[PDB]
């Protein structure tokens, strides 16, 4: 199957009761063992006398695809509007799936990932309270940039940097609608890895865990207008979508609450809920 | 038979040998060859003078020294007083020609040291005195010599011809991208560069217009020891090839 | 009008889009196509062409001179003794980082295929020597000996006649391609060069020579994610 | 150069609706999501056993 | 191929991995002489004995429009909302390359090069402070002329020029997406010069250098507002996209920090970064 | 130019949303396909495997 | 409805733009075409019909007269005698500036091909000489004497009943294209009239009389890069 | 009179996708850029040589 | 009912790419603007004679 190829599909159906009779035998369906590590393939026919069910419902929505491929928040950046001197004027992220907690335990399911992404961005400004308040302030664009790994870092709010040569940026004015890019797979490896129980060092040491190969780059972000008298702040929420999807080794989906960006870090929690008796209704 | 060491050149009058060669490079993988009626702009018969033109012209040699940092010449402004070739350029507002370049330099077994022969397309130096503009006189002697510096200054309108960084700031290490040899003495006792006319318009003024530079640079500086045989020169002899040139008036300069 | 709808993207402008546009001078006749010797039609070309290597380091003042491309050899020097190492990661070490090959490497930050270092021998053609050239792949540490050395990637270079010998270095890696950037995981391992015998010469001969190494890539390497260089940079506009 | 497929519907009472697609930029990534696979293989999780376990017949034996 | 006829490419994928076997020979392929000005064409398996690996992958990104068809900014004007009397109310670009650093070097690293070109330009708007900052302005449209070499230069924000009868314009309101045109070949040569080193004057003399060659005309920026009691000033980033391009004789790129604009001027700098030893770990 | 009329809808992002989008890195060459054992579809295909039940659930 | 997307550029305008519009008159009855002599379809065909040039440019008094279009010969003018001089910049040079070719030239940034000049003998029919026609090409400077004007393109003009010569001028450039602004890298040389022998006439008849010169554009002749004219101007509109 | 073309899509696993172009307006100058030419000839810099030399022979004899 | 017609390319190095046009208004003077028609006639203006004059023949005689 391709898919990158979109409009090319498979259309499998749930499976059908079959109608079952009485039986008084020797096959036994439903007697098993376990430690074999094989889960029991029985339908409720082997247990029970059936009817015969028509079952027309298919599974969609869970699909890899269906269920990664809904644009999710990964993390909101925040910068005002000024001079060199300020600091604040411009901002940065470096890129990583593990800041929110929704998209990572979704990601997280699955140990390697291989897909392509659409990245949506709502960028939101705010007047600072200011004498100057009143001001008649024009509509302000913006500039994301991205710098892959080994580029240039933009020091200030204005330099060199912003010009991208060879940087993909987005410019984009206000009013307008949310800036949208497509991405390719970005990886030197032939998935991206959510997890790797290894080190940065041949020597067993440096970086622990997934960090070590998730190097991605990242978002500059700045206005690319003058300032207006009284400043103005802009907040912009960076969104992915991971579309074309193939993913590999299914994982028990995360128990505890995350703790670190950084690293698979966590601290014990219960299995379960507790319940007031082993006999409930 | 046939050892490929061994090399015979014949031009017009003239024959250049060498018995230790490492093949030719023709530039860009291009032999040279006259301006086809596709290709053409000026309307006017192009006088072709052949042999008389396209023949071996020597130019003034230069010596080779330990310590002495590299040399360059500017086609075709080298050859503006080279016999017939250097008349037809002084006559003509246009002119065009590809070249056989060829380097001489010999030594001995006990001689040591390696220059680069490169031939530079559009070799646009820059000036010494970085606020100020560069000149002709301190950017070409015709055909004797221009050196490059291991001094970092120069007088004024001078070239800032700091060897590293090979006149052009860039770095002297990669101007083998442009067709060259190398004249390591161990290995052989000359270049040979056959340049096609590269430029961005089918002819163009003689004098005003440097087509390409030719650099020896010494990347390994010569050596050898105990009276063993001090002076070493380096002689470029070079023949024009596939010449032609369009639009005649008087004697020409200004 | 034909109901169209307008989705998220409108209206802005990504650098790297492709567009097409409305030409400001219509019908213009561009100036008729000439042939023009030397078409470059991709970096590549340029990387696999060979430049030579400033791995006479140690110095600015050498670095600022011609010294930076020639290494130092010498006649009666004892056998395992090392002439140079370094690790392997082109665009990044200052070795080969600013060469041809390494100033392409620093418009992109992947990088993928073998290099091939050529050593030419610039000494007296009366002079000999035999040396051992190598490449650790990563993962040890770099080859402190000859022995640790002659157990990686190796050739064993007699200069003679041909001038040059070639050092070709395979791509050994975990990963279909590395960075440019300097990276713990693309690590790229260590090339070395030994004496595997020594430099010996007759009675008026200089006592020391010089090697000089050429590099340049393959054509089993590529390059990705396009980027701007750290090389070039400016307070304000140029006048 | 377009492509005619079938939309997502419903079970019908005792149907085929189609859909157009153009490509419109040079790059696959571009593309919309491969929404329409319904494929599966539950097996290399549910049965990843050397010997193939026959239901009707005890497990061990 | 056609450089103008985009959809028409040409899949050229990297070279396969033979496999090699041990050797005992006369044959020597890593033996040869640097002297003859040739690379030598040297592949693993002539040193070593490798496996077959079969390379997929394709020198896409390196191709010459992919390195120069992203979209780089080239320079930034500055022009307020005023009178006739206001010298500051409108602004003028001779247009040129070797404003900025970035893509000066990435064009230089060919001698000739021959391409379309994609104008796209952002304006941006801000108040001035002002007592009157107060004020109701309404939506700025600009005016972007270009005159090219040989016609009427704009004296002032008001002049006859700007009725452009022949001239190119672009007429852009605030708000809406940036203005975009493209270029043809724009040259009287067949391909334009990165380099010329050469003279304005057949006496060997006047100007030297690129300067000479690169003859492109002007951009006149301006508000077609009239003032609002408060002024506000707008900065327009003209950015320059090279496509359907073709590039002669490759250079090596540049060492040396860029100095003028009108000149190759450069002072000299070091060939490489220095290290702590000739052996490095 | 050919008259479009903008219908309701035009210009809002909706999470889940299947439009096509220009890519940021054009021509980008991807690290080719390899197989990777285990390979995961459709999230039943993980419903479908045997956990074990916490039903021993009394206290914490 | 169908999901559109905006591009960079929506909504600007463009001078030079080529779109479809909606009319503001619909179905409109146009006046049915008629036949109407001499069509032009292209100013080329205006720059291709002969103009008299300004040559007796030496006053403003005779540049506001009839003498600007005059040149005055005279009997017993010495053989190497010049009788005019100028650099060849069509469009840019005041004695070829503001003719038919001239004025075509000035809404264009680039022109090519070759030019020709018509010069037309008005003196005496009883009268008699012989000139030499030349055009020098750039590089060597304008030629000081009939024997540097003799070196280049030329023609010998002797005058008779077909009362005019004309000296066509080739087009010889590195380029293509030449500006139509002065500037010094497209520069074209320049054309000179010389007396080859001398005007000479019989016993009453007048001493001096006149020559005068047609200029027009040859079929390889061509304009681009369109542009507004320096020529016209306003300060305010006219009522 | 519309162009389909190749889709840039990847190696797969042990393929074709395609994209529709119409020029829009009358002058190439307007058109998308040429970016899936991936031909090159790196020969005229790495080996510009009159005689052609082989690998497995020596350089110079 | 679309109209394709060739683009303005330029002398190559020793082509046709094409443009698609739908006229999209009921009255011809709402369209694009006739750019390509390069015919010309110079002889009503350049040569308006009765009797041919031949070049290589005397203007009088
Ligand atoms: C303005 C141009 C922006 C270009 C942005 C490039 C963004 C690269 C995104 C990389 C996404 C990586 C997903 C990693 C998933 C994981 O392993 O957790
Ligand atoms: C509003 C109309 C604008 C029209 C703008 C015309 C711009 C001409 C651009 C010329 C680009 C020249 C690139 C030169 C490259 C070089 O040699 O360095
Ligand atoms: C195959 O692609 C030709 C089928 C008819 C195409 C109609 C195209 C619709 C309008 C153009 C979309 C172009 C996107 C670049
Ligand atoms: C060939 O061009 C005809 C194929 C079908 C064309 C569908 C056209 C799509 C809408 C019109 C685009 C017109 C651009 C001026
Ligand atoms: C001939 O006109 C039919 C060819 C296919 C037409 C595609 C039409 C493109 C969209 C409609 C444009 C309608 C303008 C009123």
Redo the contacts with the bound molecule.
Sequence with gaps: GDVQNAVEGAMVRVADTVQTSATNSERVPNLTAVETGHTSQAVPGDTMQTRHVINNHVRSESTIENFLARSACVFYLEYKTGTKEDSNSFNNWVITTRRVAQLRRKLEMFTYLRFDMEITVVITSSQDQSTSQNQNAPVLTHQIMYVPPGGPIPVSVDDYSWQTSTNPSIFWTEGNAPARMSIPFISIGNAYSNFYDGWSHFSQAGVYGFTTLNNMGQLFFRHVNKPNPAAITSVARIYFKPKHVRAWVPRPPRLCPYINSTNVNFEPKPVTEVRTNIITT | GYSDRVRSITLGNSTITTQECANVVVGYGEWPEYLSDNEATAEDQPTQPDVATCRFYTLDSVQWENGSPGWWWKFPDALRDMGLFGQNMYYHYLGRAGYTIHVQCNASKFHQGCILVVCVPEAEMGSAQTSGVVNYEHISKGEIASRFTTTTTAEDHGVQAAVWNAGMGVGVGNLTIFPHQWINLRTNNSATIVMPYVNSVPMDNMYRHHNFTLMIIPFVPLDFSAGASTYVPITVTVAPMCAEYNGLRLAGHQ | GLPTMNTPGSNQFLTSDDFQSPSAMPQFDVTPEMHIPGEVRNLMEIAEVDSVMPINNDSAAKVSSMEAYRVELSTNTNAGTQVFGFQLNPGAESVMNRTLMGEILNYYAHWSGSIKITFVFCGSAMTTGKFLLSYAPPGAGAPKTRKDAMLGTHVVWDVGLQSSCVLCIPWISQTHYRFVEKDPYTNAGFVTCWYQTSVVSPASNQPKCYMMCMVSACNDFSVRMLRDTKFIEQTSFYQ | ??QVSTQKTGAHETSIIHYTN?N?YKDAASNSANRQDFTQDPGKFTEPMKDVMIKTLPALN
């Design positions: 150069g377009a153009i419109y």
